[PDB]
Amino acid sequence: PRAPRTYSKTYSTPKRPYESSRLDAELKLAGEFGLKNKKEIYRISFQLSKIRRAARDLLTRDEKDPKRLFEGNALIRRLVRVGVLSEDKKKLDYVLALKVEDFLERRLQTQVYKLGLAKSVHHARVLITQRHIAVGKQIVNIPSFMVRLDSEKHIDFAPTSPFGGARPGRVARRNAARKAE
Template sequence: MPRLKTVQSKVTKSPRRPFEKERLDQELKLIGTFGLKNKREVWRVKYTLAKVRKAARNALLRRLVKIGVLDETKMKLDYVLGLKVEDFLERRLQTQVFKLGLAKSIHHARILIKQHHIRVRRQVVDVPSFIVRLDSQKHIDFSLQSPYGGGRPGRVKRRTLRKGDGAGDDDEE
């Protein structure tokens, strides 16, 4: 039976400088402490750790750019450490509704959200602390069921319409 070919990825990375006193001593200490067979096993673990760190760094930066807290030109960990509370508070739905002019004040924005008047894309969101992604920001508007969005009119407007219809019927008779 023929042997199947497998794709093998790189598992180790040898050091750039072969003779560094500090690194050689550190590797020798690790070999003795953990009972490793050779330095290639140390290099394999270091390479795996480097891949995990790189993946975590990229995932964090990508996530912060996606929600709009970090700019694409500032995709470095130094900028992440410089983030402030205000950067995250700017991305809340309550703040975005006020900034877009859908509400008269920041407090009015909170009330509109809690009373189901605001939607993001097609989904009605009733959580003021909802973090709005950068691509969803342009899809914030009034709900279709909301009187602000052309839905059923509110209580006062319905009453005035009813009075207007009732008065019109009496005049015709």
């Protein structure tokens, strides 16, 4: 038979989901970032935990270790590229200082909100899911899309979108047709 295709879980349930302080924390995160459910928060937390555990393991290694240098440098480059880690903080210690909010801001939903294309984070979500937002020349419909520094300046209304210069959507032309008739 054909060789297996690997798969993995992108989120993990917390050690104690029932902490009241925690519950308030996810309430904050969902409310401010307009997240649909808790699974999104758990996913981001799992990714962050993997990153910081790798950083800790790298720190345990002695300085100038070739593995340390190579892998730490790669991790810092990736974190800088996605934009969570600022340029002036290129050391493994500050990686351990990252927070869930940093990743959350880089989500295409939040970036769309900040750029002024949407009046609410929920408005940003509905705009994205309705194929109105394009990074560069390509249309992205996924709120969880993570924006890179270079990609940030290229977010715009899609060419095919009615807001982006295309013809009016179905409702608009339907109303115009009935009005003319």
